[PDB]
Amino acid sequence: PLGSMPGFSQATELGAWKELQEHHNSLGRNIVLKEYFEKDPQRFEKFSRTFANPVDNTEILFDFSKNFLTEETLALLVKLAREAGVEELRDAMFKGDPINFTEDRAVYHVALRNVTNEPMQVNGKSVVEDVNSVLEHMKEFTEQVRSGEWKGYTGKKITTIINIGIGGSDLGPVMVTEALKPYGAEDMTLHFVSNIDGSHIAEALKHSDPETTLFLIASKTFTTAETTTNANSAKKWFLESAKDEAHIAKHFVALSTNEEEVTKFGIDKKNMFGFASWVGGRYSVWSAIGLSVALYIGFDNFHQFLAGAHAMDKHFRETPLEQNIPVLGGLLSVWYSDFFGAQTHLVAPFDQYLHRFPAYLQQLSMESNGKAITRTGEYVKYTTGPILFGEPATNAQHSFFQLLHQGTKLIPSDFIMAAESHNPVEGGKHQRMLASNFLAQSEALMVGKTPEQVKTEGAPDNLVPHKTFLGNRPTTSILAQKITPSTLGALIAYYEHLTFTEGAVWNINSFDQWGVELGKVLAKKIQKELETPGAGGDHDASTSGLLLAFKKKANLA
Amino acid sequence: PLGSMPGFSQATELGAWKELQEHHNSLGRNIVLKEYFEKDPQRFEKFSRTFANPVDNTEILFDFSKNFLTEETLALLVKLAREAGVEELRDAMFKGDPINFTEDRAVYHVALRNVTNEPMQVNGKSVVEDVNSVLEHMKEFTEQVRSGEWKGYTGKKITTIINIGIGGSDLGPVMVTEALKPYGAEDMTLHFVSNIDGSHIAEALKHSDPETTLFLIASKTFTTAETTTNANSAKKWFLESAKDEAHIAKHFVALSTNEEEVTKFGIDKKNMFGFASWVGGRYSVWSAIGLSVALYIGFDNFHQFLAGAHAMDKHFRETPLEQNIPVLGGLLSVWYSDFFGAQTHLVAPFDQYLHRFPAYLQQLSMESNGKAITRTGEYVKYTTGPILFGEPATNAQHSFFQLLHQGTKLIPSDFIMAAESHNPVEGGKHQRMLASNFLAQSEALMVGKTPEQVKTEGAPDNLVPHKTFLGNRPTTSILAQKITPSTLGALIAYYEHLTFTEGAVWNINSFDQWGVELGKVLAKKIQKELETPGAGGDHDASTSGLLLAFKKKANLA
Ligand SMILES: O=P(O)(O)OC[C@H]1O[C@@H](O)[C@H](O)[C@@H](O)[C@@H]1O
Ligand SMILES: O=P(O)(O)OC[C@H]1O[C@@H](O)[C@H](O)[C@@H](O)[C@@H]1O
Ligand SMILES: [Cl-]
Ligand SMILES: [Cl-]
Ligand SMILES: [Cl-]
Ligand SMILES: [Cl-]
Ligand code: NA
Ligand code: NA
Questions:
Q1: How many Cα atoms within 13 Å fall on the side-chain side of residue A119?
Q2: What are the φ and ψ backbone dihedral angles of A413, each rounded to 5 degrees?
Q3: A155: exposed, middle or buried (C-beta count within 10 Å: 0-12, 13-18, 19+)?
Q4: Distance B184 CA to ligand 8 centre (A)
Q5: Which residues contact B176 (CB under 8 A, 6 or more apart)?
Q6: Nearest C-alpha of chain A: how many angstroms from B413?
Q7: How far apart are the C-alpha atoms of A363 and A348, rounded to whole Å?
Q8: What angle do CA B38, B44, B47 make, to 5 degrees?
Q9: Helix axes A86-95, A299-318, angle to 10 degrees
Q10: B433:A407 CB<8 A
C-alpha cells in the first residue's frame, strides 16, 4: 500500500542546515587543521572510530580527525541527520518498505547478506528462504565447477570463466575478483566482457577454448543492448565449434531477474541464478551476480564476504549517530559538497589489488546520488553527489597528487590501506614503504610546508612560492588488518551506507536511475539510421554532421 | 643566459579576461545549446575542425559546436590567447628556450618526434643527432629481441617484457601498448610493475621465467624510491635462478637520464637508452621510455606514432588561433573552469583498447596544471587545472552517466571514437552499436527531454520531474578513422598542446612538479621510524595515532 508524506522537502529548509551555514560563515571556513591539532592533543581520540570485524576477528580504524570537524561541527551534522530522518529511512530500508519511491520498490541488498537469517520481508512475504535457495544453488554449482565434476561438452574441466554483463553486472565482479586475487583458483582464467565495442569480446574469445570456457550471462533485465549482443556473439563462437545446441547447457548459465528472457535465450531453467527486483545493479555483487566471485575464490570465501557486509549493516543499524561510521562519512560529504563547494571526492587505496575499487565506488556513488529531484518532486536548491574518482597509491602520487598538494580545488580524500600484505616481498620492505606513503601523504596534506621552512632548506628566495605547501587539505584514513573477503565486504558496505546517508540528507532517491533512458532510446534510433540508406538527417546540425562523417568514414549509405 | 620579464602577471589583469567576464554576465551564462542549433543551421560548420593525418592518410574531425560558444565567445577567447602570449610561449618552446622557469630547463618533448629532422637546439647545441642515435639504438635492440637474435642466459628467445617504473615511466607505456594491442607481437607478454606495493612485482614474477624475461628499468632520475626497490627485488629473483651476475646483461636494460646511477645498479652502459633533462616524465613516452611500445608493436609502428604527434605539432605551430585545434580545446577548458565554475573534465573514449587513456591524461593534465603560482611568483586569483577523470564508453554510460545527465555539476566532456574497429565482430554490428551510443550521448546531453515530451510518452504526472532531462550539457566529439599508431600519436599531442594552452593562459609552469616533494621527504622519515623500535611519536596526533595502530597491527616495536 501507499505510505506517509516525506518528513521534509528541501534540505535547505531544515533548521540544522541553517545552523550549519551560520557555523560555516563564522568558524568552519576558518578551520586550519594544523592549529586544531596544536591546540587539541586528544583530536585523534575524538574523531577516530574502530569497527570490529567479527568474521576475521580484526579491527578497521576509521580516522576522521584530519577533516574540517570540531565538536560543534559534529553536533550540528548529527542534528541535520536527525532532522532529515536518516535513521527513519534506514529502518524503513531494513523493514523492506518501498523507499525507492519512483519505482515503488523495496531496497533490499541488506537481505542478500542476512547470514544470521534474521526475519526479512517485502510486501508481507519473507525473502529469506528464496535468498538462501539461490545461495545453496551457487554453492553446489561452484563446488561442481571447481572440483571438475561439471564438465564441458567434450568432458574437460572448465578452466576459463567469461562473465558477460555491464555496469552493476560487471564492475562488482571485476573489482572483487581483482581485490581478492590471493584467494583465487590457480588454474582458472577470468574474463569480464562488458563494452559493446567488439574489441572486448574478441580479445576474451581469442585465447579461450570452447571446450573449457563457461559463460555467465549477467543481466538483471536480460534485455540490455550490450549484454544481449555480446551473449549472442559468444553463443555463435561456441556453436561454430560445438555444432550442437544441446551443448549450450554445459557452457552457459544466466544471472537474472527475468526467467522468461533467459529461457528465450536458450539457457536451461536449472542453470538460472535469480535475484529480485529490489536488488539494484550497483548493489548486486552480494546476489547471484557474485557467481564469478564464488567460482574464483570458492563459496566459503564468498560467504565470508557477505558476512563482513552483514557486520557493517549491524553497525549502521544499531550505532547511535555520534559514533556511526558510515553516517559520519556521509555527513562529511554533505559538509564539503554543500558548504565548502567541493565538486569531487577522491578515493585512493594504498593497495594494488584494489586498483578497480575507485571505479566500483564511482558507479555506487554517482549513479545513486547524481540526482536533482526531491521526494516531494522539487528541484534541489543545493548540489548533490560529487564526481568520485581515484587510482591506487602509490601510483596516484606520481600521477595527480601534484594537484592535490598545490592546485586550486578542495578535494575531500579517503586513503585506505591494510597493515598486512598477502605478498610480503623482501622481508616486508615493500609493505613498510607502502605504509610510510599512506601515513606521510595525509600528514603532508594537513601540515604543508611554510615559506619559512622552505627558506631554511636553502631554496632560492624567488622559488619559495613554487615550493610552499599551504597544507590544510583534509583526508580520511582507513586502516584495516588485511584485505580478507569479510574485510572487503565491510569496506563496500561502509561506502553503501555513506551513499545512503548522503541521499537521505539530500532527500533524493539513491536507488533509481531514470537518467540513463534518454541515451538508450536515442542510440536505438541512430542505430536504425546507420542501418538505413539515406537516413540520419533528422537531428541537430552537430549530431547530423557527426553521423554523416561517420557514414562517410565507415562506408555506409 | 637569463631572458625577459613575463608578458603578464595574473590572467585576471588582461583586458580580454575582463571582456570575457562581461560576456559571461550578459550572454554566455544564458546560452541554451538547443536554441542556438534551432536558430543557426551552420553552427556545426562554424565550430568543427578537421585535422589531416598525413602518416595514415586519414582525417580526425574535432566537433566543438555542442560547447558554450558563439562567434563572439570564440573571438574573445582567441583575444585572451593573444594577450596571454600563447603563440610566443609556444614558439619559445619549439626554439628550445628554458620556458620551464622554476628549473631553468628547456621543454623539448617536441624534439623527440622531430621525424623530418628540422633543426632543433638547446643551449646553442643541436639535439637532433642525439635524439636520432637513441632511436637507432631502440630500432636495433627491438629488432634483435623480436627476431630472437637477442637471447636469454640459457639461449632462449625473450617472450616476457617487464617494465619497472612509476608515473611518466609507466602510464604512457601501459596506455599505448593497451591502445595499440592489435599491432602487438602474438608471442609476447607485457607486465607493467609500478606500485611499491609488493603485490605488483609479485604477480608479474609469479608467471614469468627468468630464462625468457627481459626487464626495462624505466626511471628519468634512476633514484625513485618505488622503482629502485622493485628493480632490486626483480634482480634478486633473477639471480636466485641465474646465479651469475654476468647474466644480468642479457635480462636488464635501463631507460634513464642518469648514466652514473644506471652503472651503479649493474646495467652494462651499452644497454642504457638515454633521454634528456628537457623530457618531462608525463611527456616521455616519445623517448627511450617508449621502448616497451617499440618492443611490442615494432620500431616502424613506434616511428609512425612519433610521426602522428609531429603532424599535430606542425598544426599547433603553424595554424592561426581561429582554426587551431588544441588552442580551442585549451581555451574551452579556461572558459568552463574560470567563468562557469566547472572543477572537472571528463574524457570518455568510445573504445575499449583506449581504457587507460583517461588515466594517462589525468597525469598529463593534473600534474602539469595543478599549480597556483604565476611566472611572476604570485598566487593565482582564479582556479587552474581541473580534476580530469573518465572510463571508456559504453561502460562509462552504465557507471556514472546518470550524474552527467541528471546531477548538479557542469562537466565539460570529450567523447572520442574511431569510425572503424580492428575487431569488426558480427559483420560490424558491435561497431554500429558503439557508434550509435557515441552519437546519441552527445545528442542527449544537448537536447534533453522536456516535461511536455515526458508526459506525451505516458509517464505518471507525479514522476515527470524524475524523468525530465534539462539538457544543455556541453560536449566535444572527436571522430577518427581508425586508432592506428599515428592517429594515437596525434590524439596525445592534441591533449599535450591543450594542456600547454591552459598553462600559458593561467601563467603557470605546466612543466615542473614541486608538489610531489613533501610527501616523499615525510615518507622517508616515517619509513625510518617504522624500522626503529620505540620511534614514531614526533607527529600530529592523527599521524601518530595511525602510525601506532599500524605498528600494533603489523607487529613492529
Ligand atoms: O544488469 P542489467 O539489467 O543488464 O543492467 C546493467 C546496468 O545497466 C545500466 O543502464 C544502469 O546504468 C545500471 O544500473 C545497470 O547496472
Ligand atoms: O621516471 P622517474 O625519475 O622515476 O619519476 C617517475 C615519476 O615520479 C613522480 O614523483 C613525478 O610525479 C612524475 O613526474 C614522474 O614521472
Ligand atoms: Cl574540537
Ligand atoms: Cl594506475
Ligand atoms: Cl554563434
Ligand atoms: Cl570500466
Ligand atoms: Na574473511
Ligand atoms: Na599509422
A1: 2
A2: -135, 135
A3: exposed
A4: 14
A5: B285, B290, B293, B305, B488
A6: 13
A7: 16
A8: 120
A9: 140
A10: no
Tell me the structure's resolution in angstroms, rounded to a single decimal: 1.8
The amino acid at residue B61 is L
Distance A285 CA to ligand 4 centre (A): 24
d(CA B63, CA B474): 11
For chain A, how far is it from start to end, CA to CA, in angstroms?
A: 54
Window 374-413 of A: residues touching B by CB (8 A cutoff) are 377-380, 382-389, 391-395, 397-409, 411
Beta strands (DSSP E) in A165-212 are 189-193
User: Residue for cell digits 534551432?
Assistant: B38
Distance CA A524, CA A547 (A): 14
Q: Alpha-carbon distance A172 to B150, whole Å?
A: 43
Decide if A177 touches B, using CB distance below 8 A.
no
Question: Which amino acid belongs to residue A297?
Answer: I
Q: Which single residue is written with the C-alpha cell 626511471? A: B219
Domain extent listing, chain A: 1-108+304-516, 109-303, 517-557
Neighbours of A487 (CB within 10 A): 23
How many angstroms separate the CA atoms of A543 and A540, rounded? 6
The sign of the torsion formed by the CA atoms of A350, A354, A360, A361 equals negative
Residue A220, ligand 1, Cβ within 6 A: yes
How far is ligand 6, taken at its centre, from the CA of residue B227, in Å?
Answer: 27
Experimental technique behind these coordinates: X-ray
Cell numbers at A192, concatenated: 569480464
Please report which residue ranges of A370-469 form alpha helices under DSSP H. 401-406, 429-447, 451-456, 464-467
Strand order in the sheet with A387-389: A48-53, A58-63, A475-480, A413-418, A344-349, A387-389
- Whether the CA torsion B87, B91, B97, B102 is positive or negative: it is positive
Clarify whether A371 is annotated catalytic: no
Q: How far apart are CA A224 and CA A226, in angstroms?
A: 6
Asked if B271 and B288 count as a contact pair (C-beta separation under 8 A), the reply is no
Give dist(CA A184, CA A188) in Å, integer: 8
Q: Provide the pairing of β-strand A252-256 with A272-274.
A: parallel
Closest residue by CA, ligand 2 atom 9: A398
> Is the CB of A343 inside 8 Å of chain B's CB atoms?
yes
Give residue A217's identity as a one-letter amino acid code.
Answer: I
Catalytic sites of B, residue numbers: 367, 398, 520
Residue type, B556: L
User: How far, in Å, are A36, A143, A144, A274, A291 from residue A137 at the CA level?
Assistant: 55, 10, 11, 10, 10
Distance B365 CA to ligand 5 centre (A): 29
What contacts A90, CB < 8 A, 6 or more positions away? Answer: A316, A317, A500, A504
Contact B348, B414 (CB under 8 A): yes
A29 reaches B (C-beta below 8 A): no
Which phi and psi (to 5°) does residue A439 adopt?
-70, -45
Rounded to 5 degrees, φ, ψ at B539 are -145, 170
Minimum Cα–Cα distance from A442: chain B residue? B543
Instruction: Give me B337's grid cell.
Output: 573552469
Vertex A216: Cα angle to A210 and A217 (nearest 5)? 110
Cβ contact (<8 Å) for B367 and A203? no
Rounded Cα gap, residues A3 and A92, in angstroms: 11
Whether the Cβ atoms of residue B108 and residue B99 lie closer than 8 Å to each other: no
Query: Any chain A CB within 8 A of the CB of B160?
Result: no
Looking at residue B502, its amino acid is: E
The answer to whether residues B196 and A431 touch, using CB atoms and an 8 Å cutoff, is: no
d(CA A510, CA A496): 10
A520 assigned to active site: yes
> Which residue(s) pair with B256 in the sheet?
B274
Nearest to A407 among B61, B371, B404 (CB): B371
Question: A283 exposed, middle or buried (CB, 10 Å; 0-12, 13-18, 19+)?
Answer: buried
